[PDB]
Amino acid sequence: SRANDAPIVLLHGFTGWGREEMFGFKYWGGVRGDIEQWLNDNGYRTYTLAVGPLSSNWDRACEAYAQLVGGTVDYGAAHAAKHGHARFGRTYPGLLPELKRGGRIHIIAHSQGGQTARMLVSLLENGSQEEREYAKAHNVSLSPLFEGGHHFVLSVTTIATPHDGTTLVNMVDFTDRFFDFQKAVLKAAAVASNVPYTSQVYDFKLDQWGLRRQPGESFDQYFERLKRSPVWTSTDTARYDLSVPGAEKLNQWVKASPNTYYLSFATERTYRGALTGNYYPELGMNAFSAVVCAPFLGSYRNATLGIDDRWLENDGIVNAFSMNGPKRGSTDRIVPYDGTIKKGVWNDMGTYNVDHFEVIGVDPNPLFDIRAFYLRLAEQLASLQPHHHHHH
């Protein structure tokens, strides 16, 4: 039945928060409950990571590592010099100090979470040649995360991840539209955007950039400030990594480890129009996605960028064609699931009829058994064999 005892770790996208944030409301579960809890009750040790939702995958990856092993976030000296932010972040206690002693984990990531998870794997296993070269060139200390040689991750599961980016950013008004997604998760959780709460509520963890919501500042007001900040204007952001070109770049160095299993899940909440060839939002898609983005994703074409008709289908925020695994600028192989979970290859699990937010329970969908979906997932992860024997 079960082949391993690795704990499961949860990871979010451009939206996300800690278990104690959003007054109880969990990113993993939302209006449908508590995912991390359900899995623990069913006997699968499960934890949750909270990283900078608008930060680049690199920053998140450094935060994920430190949050898992414990310590102060070290973004890398060369990295910090190149982007002009702090080298050191926040300090963590360490969710799983067992990792530094031979332990392994299973990473279930959603949205942009999937790129982060890939990146963390590639850094753990290979480190950063540039970071290593800069350490000795300028005699600065070096994070273990940049030496290579770690083997913490048994598997990586991706759900609605923009492996090849999303064409949602190509919107002319993407800046304003995008912060409406943060406003939306705030409403999902019953939190207003026009109110200066004195309690944090939603920490964007921008310690490296020196940004934070201040006194008598409503999320709306704070979002206006962010838009003009490096978090939204520099390449070292989630906005860059989310774009087609940015993903392509990330795809060029972030490869699938041969020692790690990879699982892909794709989402889709659309229908094809017979005369236009466009995709249109289905009944039950969240109102923010259905009004502005869903129509853009299913009609947006760009020949020079490589955007044709296979990119139309979407989950209201991310193109479905970009979820089965990195393709643009990648050497990673993808194989359709045939009952056998191979290692070092993207095991394409197919497309599911749920939106970007229905998969995590942030948006409701009673036609979707979210409990069964994540219980099936973990049962599958526990059955993964650490070392598989070659056979007939």
Interacting positions 67-86 with Zn ion (CB under 5 A): 83
Please indicate if the annotation marks 164 as binding a ligand: no
Q: Which stretch binds Zn ion (CB under 5 A): 10-18, 135-143, 157-165, 234-242?
A: 234-242
The minimum distance between CB 309 and Ca ion, in angstroms, equals: 26
Contacts of 211 (CB under 8 A, 6+ apart): 204, 225, 226, 229, 231
Q: Which stretch binds Ca ion (CB under 5 A): 143-151, 204-212, 364-372, 373-381?
A: 364-372
Please, how many CA atoms are within 13 Å of residue 156, restricted to the half-sphere of its CB? 29
Nearest residue to Ca ion, by Cβ distance, number only: 284
Q: Known catalytic residue: 356?
A: yes
Please indicate if the annotation marks 236 as binding a ligand: yes
Contacts of 297 (CB under 8 A, 6+ apart): 166, 167, 168, 279, 311, 312, 314, 316, 317, 318, 319
User: What SS3 class is residue 215?
Assistant: coil
Please indicate if the annotation marks 79 as binding a ligand: yes
Q: Which stretch binds Zn ion (CB under 5 A): 104-112, 230-238, 330-338, 351-359?
A: 230-238
Contact 325, 160 (CB under 8 A): no
The minimum distance between CB 80 and Zn ion, in angstroms, equals: 7
Q: Is 382 exposed, middle or buried (0-12, 13-18, 19+ CB in 10 A)?
A: middle
Active-site residue identified among 111, 122, 322, 330: 111
Q: Which stretch binds Ca ion (CB under 5 A): 131-139, 156-164, 276-284, 288-296?
A: 276-284
Check residue 365 for interaction with Ca ion (CB under 5 A): yes
The minimum distance between CB 321 and Ca ion, in angstroms, equals: 22
Kindly state the number of chain residues that form the binding site for Ca ion, as judged by CB under 5 A: 3
Check residue 236 for interaction with Zn ion (CB under 5 A): yes
Please indicate if the annotation marks 36 as binding a ligand: no
Find the binder of Ca ion among 284, 295, 329, 344 (CB under 5 A). Answer: 284
Check residue 289 for interaction with Ca ion (CB under 5 A): no
Which of Ca ion, Zn ion, none is residue 59 near (CB under 5 to 8 Å by kind)? Zn ion
Token pair of 111 as six digits: 């949205």
Find the binder of Zn ion among 59, 207, 313, 355 (CB under 5 A). Answer: 59
Q: Which stretch binds Zn ion (CB under 5 A): 57-65, 116-124, 168-176, 339-347?
A: 57-65
Q: Known catalytic residue: 150?
A: no
Token pair of 70 as six digits: 């414990």
Please indicate if the annotation marks 59 as binding a ligand: yes
Q: Which of 4, 331, 56, 14 is nearest to 174 (CA)?
A: 14
User: What SS3 class is residue 218?
Assistant: coil
**Helices 113-126/244-253 angle, 10° precision:** 20
Q: Is 350 exposed, middle or buried (0-12, 13-18, 19+ CB in 10 A)?
A: exposed
Active-site residue identified among 315, 332, 348, 355: 315
The minimum distance between CB 282 and Zn ion, in angstroms, equals: 37
Name residue 186's amino acid: L
Sign of CA dihedral 47, 11, 51, 356: negative
Contact 241, 13 (CB under 8 A): no
Q: Any idea which residue has 């993808």 for tokens? A: 334
Please indicate if the annotation marks 364 as binding a ligand: yes
Residue 275 vs 283, nearer CB to Ca ion: 283
Token pair of 273 as six digits: 């129009």
Find the binder of Ca ion among 36, 207, 348, 363 (CB under 5 A). Answer: 363
Residue 264 vs 365, nearer CB to Ca ion: 365
Q: Known catalytic residue: 111?
A: yes
Residue 71 vs 284, nearer CB to Ca ion: 284
Residue 125 vs 355, nearer CB to Ca ion: 355
Contacts of 197 (CB under 8 A, 6+ apart): 191
Residue 125 vs 363, nearer CB to Ca ion: 363
Contact 176, 10 (CB under 8 A): no
H-helix segments, the chain: 35-41, 57-69, 77-83, 113-126, 129-137, 174-188, 219-227, 230-233, 238-242, 244-253, 287-288, 294-297, 370-382
**Binding-site residues from annotation for Ca(2+):** 284, 358, 363-364
Binding-site residue set for Zn(2+): 59, 79, 85, 236
Residues carrying an active site annotation: 111, 315, 356
User: What does the binding site for Zn ion look like in residue numbers (CB under 5 A)?
Assistant: 59, 83, 236
Binding site, residues? 59, 79, 85, 236, 284, 358, 363-364
- Give the binding site for Ca ion (CB under 5 A): 284, 363, 365
